[PDB]
Design a protein around this ligand. Structure first.
Ligand SMILES: Cc1c(Sc2cccc(C(=O)O)c2F)c2ccc(Cl)c(F)c2n1CC(=O)N1CC2(CC2)c2ccccc21
Ligand SMILES: *[C@@H]1O[C@H](CO)[C@@H](O[C@@H]2O[C@H](CO)[C@@H](O)[C@H](O)[C@H]2NC(C)=O)[C@H](O)[C@H]1NC(C)=O
Ligand SMILES: CCCCCCCCCCCCCC(=O)OC[C@@H](O)COP(=O)(O)O
Ligand SMILES: [Ca+2]
Ligand SMILES: [Cl-]
Ligand code: NA
Ligand code: NA
Ligand SMILES: [Zn+2]
Ligand SMILES: [Zn+2]
Length: 776
């Protein structure tokens, strides 16, 4: 009946005016029928059958029931069979492998329940069975990782919506817990109504993907005011619905342990209770499912949004100690900083000046300013109009605020997503996940694809790498295919004499490709060039290599370049003068110098060293960046070879002038070496590969591979590195670590595909390419 929730509690629709609502989200729109509390939120006698209620006469006021008709009526407390029928709690039962789903007739697929926990730090799982026994049984009997990496910013809204969509925040649009959109001229806040406007929420979240493909997602979101125990009872009742109504996916959200973590810090002794209380809810779910005989039917994901760090009031940096004018800016503060102009019509606003005022001003200053395009590419945090041009990455354990006038809290989060304290949890338990299986850490951007696979859905386009988590599942409906090469290489031979060239250059005169050539995944023209010490894929369009590959053995020697050869550049008789760089361009560019992708310092002989001076191995480099690049090539590469028992290196340029994380078409390139068609890269990458079993040398490795990579910003100064006035051994490797990257990041930024001929399974190589070497 319209106007009442009788017979309608938690109906799977949102009734519109003139009717009122009886669904799980009605409270959040202040729209519930007058009798919703009375009928749908019963609380009498709490959530647990006790021995004195067994054989009770049913009382309709009770939150849940313990009577002999309750299973037929669909309303037992989750512990009814345990207390009254001699059954065991789920947690007390032995792990038993689930070799196939055991679902009731009419279940077309295993249901999926996503149990999300706010601020659940990875290391809380160490507390184990004494504190969280149900969760520990899911973890030990199911599939788990040591941690899961959140997205940046490591806050709730960006992370939950990444879980929902498979997208980086810059793509889904929820780039913070608070944001300003200049086109809407509106502000999104944690507290308030503006966030409920769907206009903010981009991409295609799981519930929509499901509905579009005819999979029932029901009423996906709960009003958070509804107690957890009622949500669990409701999910279980929904799972008893007829085939034509019953949803196939459910979500639960707990605001704990985040709520307490803010008050008490990540390891306050007060944190124990909230973790026990979460475990009690997990136990109710699992007992409830066993009661319905669905405990070997439903896939359960237990997942956090981010971790929690020790952060106090007194550890706050104030912009007023740096800026000569704090009144003309608006700051989004806290564990990150975003700065824009306070007023719209402010011609005086100068982001570059503000950045300079914030750069390396105090020793051990606890934040670093960036223009968004200069942030580490691994953060993927730039390509959205809601991201302010000025960003502050704040040091773990610190806050930033505008003025002192701006302790009540002991924990916070939001920091760089490679910070260990920000890591969170993943457990997958059920028929589709593996049994008692540990998997390596992975990123939360990958989970949307997994949830799609679990539900038989085709994922919308997203930033996960589909196939990269196939090792979490007992059975895989998705078989990834290697992308086809788009441009086939040319293989030029000797076509010229040195005297055919007038480049203004002067000179006073497969082992190196271990995992197959990269594939070029865009339309272009390029040459494979072979040399004694290195191989390259030379672009005739960009006039430089797209990639340069070389193997350095553990015993390789580093040599210097003789004085008489420091400016040696040689024409390449395989490549037309028309598709070559020239040395006059560099001489005429007061700001630009050059470096080499294969370093002369690692030549195998003084005769082979002449290959390293080829014009086809040169790339444009600011002198400030050459400090970085020379140290990497002359010092670090050999160090890594010694540590890793040889390394294979692939290095190259990246062009991303519009900071979308994608390889630029030529029209986007904004800078060239003066008076030339030689484009200036925005970054230089390297992918460094060796044998995971370091007792085998990198070029004779029988097993899995070990990889680490970076994307270095190609900057005309070293203002980013506050200790750059010192020797490179004090600061270069620190810069490299900050700019660590996944191979997949480089693939997007270059339209290349790597690791195509390793003789390992492709899903394993996908995992390898999504690996991030964090340095913690
Ligand atoms: C508005 C919203 C919230 S905050 C929120 C949600 C529920 C209850 C409460 C509460 O105070 O009781 C609350 F504060 C939220 C949180 C996590 C995720 Cl992951 C979302 F996505 C959220 N959203 C969008 C949200 O619900 N869409 C976006 C969209 C794509 C357009 C869509 C379509 C259909 C149904 C829903 C949705
Ligand atoms: C992250 O994935 C999304 C979705 O595939 C990519 O965003 C799309 O980019 C294309 C190509 O420019 C646009 O035409 C689409 O409109 C975009 N979709 C969305 C939802 O934004 C994005 O490029 C990916 N990011 C990276 C770094 O690979
Ligand atoms: C497919 C996976 C979907 C993901 C789960 C869907 C359920 C999510 C419901 C979340 C409601 C959020 C309510 C809220 O507003 O709390 C935020 C606080 O914490 C404060 O933020 P923070 O932890 O400091 O970042
Ligand atoms: Ca680009
Ligand atoms: Cl934010
Ligand atoms: Na120059
Ligand atoms: Na510096
Ligand atoms: Zn959170
Ligand atoms: Zn929080």
């Amino acid at each position: 009946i319209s106007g009442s929730c009788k017979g309608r509690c938690f109906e799977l629709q949102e009734a519109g005016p003139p009717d009122c609502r009886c669904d799980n989200l009605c409270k959040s729109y202040t729209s519930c029928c007058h009798d919703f509390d009375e009928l749908c939120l019963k609380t009498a006698r709490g959530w647990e059958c006790t021995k004195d209620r067994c054989g009770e006469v049913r009382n309709e006021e009770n939150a849940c029931h313990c009577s002999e008709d309750c299973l037929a009526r669909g309303d037992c407390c989750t512990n009814y069979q345990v207390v009254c029928k001699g059954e065991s709690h789920w947690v007390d039962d032995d792990c038993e492998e689930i070799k196939a789903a055991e679902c009731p007739a009419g279940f077309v697929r295993p249901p999926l329940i996503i149990f999300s926990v706010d601020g659940f730090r990875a290391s809380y799982m160490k507390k184990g069975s004494k504190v969280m026994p149900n969760i520990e049984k899911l973890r030990s009997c199911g599939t788990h990782s040591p941690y899961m990496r959140p997205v940046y910013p490591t806050k709730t809204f960006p992370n939950l919506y990444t879980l929902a969509t498979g997208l980086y925040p810059e793509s889904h649009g929820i780039v913070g817990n608070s944001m300003y959109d200049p086109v809407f001229d509106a502000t999104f806040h944690l507290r308030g109504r503006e966030k409920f406007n769907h206009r903010w929420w981009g991409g295609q979240p799981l519930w929509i993907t499901a509905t579009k493909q005819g999979v029932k997602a029901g009423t996906f979101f709960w009003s958070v005011v509804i107690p957890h125990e009622r949500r669990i009872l409701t999910i279980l009742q929904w799972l008893t619905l007829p085939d034509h109504e019953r949803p196939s996916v459910y979500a639960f959200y707990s605001e704990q342990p985040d709520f307490s973590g803010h008050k008490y810090g990540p390891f306050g002794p007060e944190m124990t209770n909230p973790l026990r209380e979460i475990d009690k809810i997990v136990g109710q779910l699992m007992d409830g499912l066993k009661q319905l005989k669905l405990h070997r039917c439903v896939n359960v994901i237990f997942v956090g949004d981010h971790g929690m760090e020790d952060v106090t009031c007194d550890r706050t940096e104030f912009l007023s100690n740096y800026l000569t004018n704090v009144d003309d800016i608006t700051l989004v503060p806290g564990t990150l900083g975003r700065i824009r102009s306070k007023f719209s019509n402010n011609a005086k606003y100068d982001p570059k000046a503000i950045i300079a005022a914030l750069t390396c001003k105090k020793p051990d200053q606890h934040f670093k300013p960036y223009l968004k395009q200069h942030l580490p590419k691994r953060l993927h945090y730039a390509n959205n109009r809601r991201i302010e041009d000025i960003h502050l990455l704040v040091e773990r354990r610190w806050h930033v605020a505008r003025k002192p006038l701006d302790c009540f809290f002991q924990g916070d989060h939001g920091f760089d997503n490679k910070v260990n304290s920000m890591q969170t949890v993943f457990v997958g338990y059920g028929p589709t996940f593996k049994y008692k299986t540990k998997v390596p850490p992975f990123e939360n951007i990958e989970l949307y694809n997994v949830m799609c696979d679990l539900l038989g859905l085709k994922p919308a386009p997203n930033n996960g790498t589909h196939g990269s988590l196939n090792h979490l599942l007992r059975t895989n409906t998705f078989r990834p295919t290697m992308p086809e090469e788009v441009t086939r290489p040319n293989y030029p031979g000797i076509m010229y004499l040195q005297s055919d060239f007038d480049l203004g250059c002067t000179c006073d005169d497969e082992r190196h490709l271990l995992y197959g050539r990269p594939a070029v995944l865009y339309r272009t023209r390029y040459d494979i060039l072979y040399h004694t010490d290195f191989e390259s894929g030379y672009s005739e369009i960009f006039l430089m290599p797209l990639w340069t590959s070389y193997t350095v053995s553990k015993q390789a020697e580093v040599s210097s370049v003789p004085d008489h050869l420091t400016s040696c550049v040689r024409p390449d008789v395989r490549v037309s003068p028309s598709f070559s760089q020239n040395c006059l361009a560099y001489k005429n560019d007061k700001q630009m110098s050059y470096g080499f992708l294969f370093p002369p310092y690692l030549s195998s002989s003084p005769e082979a060293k002449y290959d390293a001076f080829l014009v086809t191995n040169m790339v444009p480099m600011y002198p400030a960046f050459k400090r970085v690049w020379n140290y990497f090539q002359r010092v670090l590469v050999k160090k890594y070879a010694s540590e890793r028992n040889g390394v294979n290196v692939i290095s190259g340029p990246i062009f991303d002038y519009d900071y979308d994380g994608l390889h630029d078409t030529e029209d986007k390139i904004k800078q060239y070496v003066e008076g030339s068609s030689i484009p200036v890269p925005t970054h230089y990458y390297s992918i460094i590969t060796s044998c995971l079993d370091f007792t085998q040398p990198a070029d004779k490795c029988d097993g899995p591979l070990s990889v680490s990579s970076f994307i270095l910003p190609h900057r005309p100064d070293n203002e980013e590195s506050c200790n750059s006035s010192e020797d490179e051994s004090k600061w270069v490797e620190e810069l490299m670590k900050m700019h660590t990257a996944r191979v997949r990041d480089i693939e997007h930024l270059t339209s290349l595909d790597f690791f195509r001929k390793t003789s390992r399974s492709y899903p394993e190589i996908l995992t390898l390419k999504t690996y991030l070497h964090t340095y913690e």
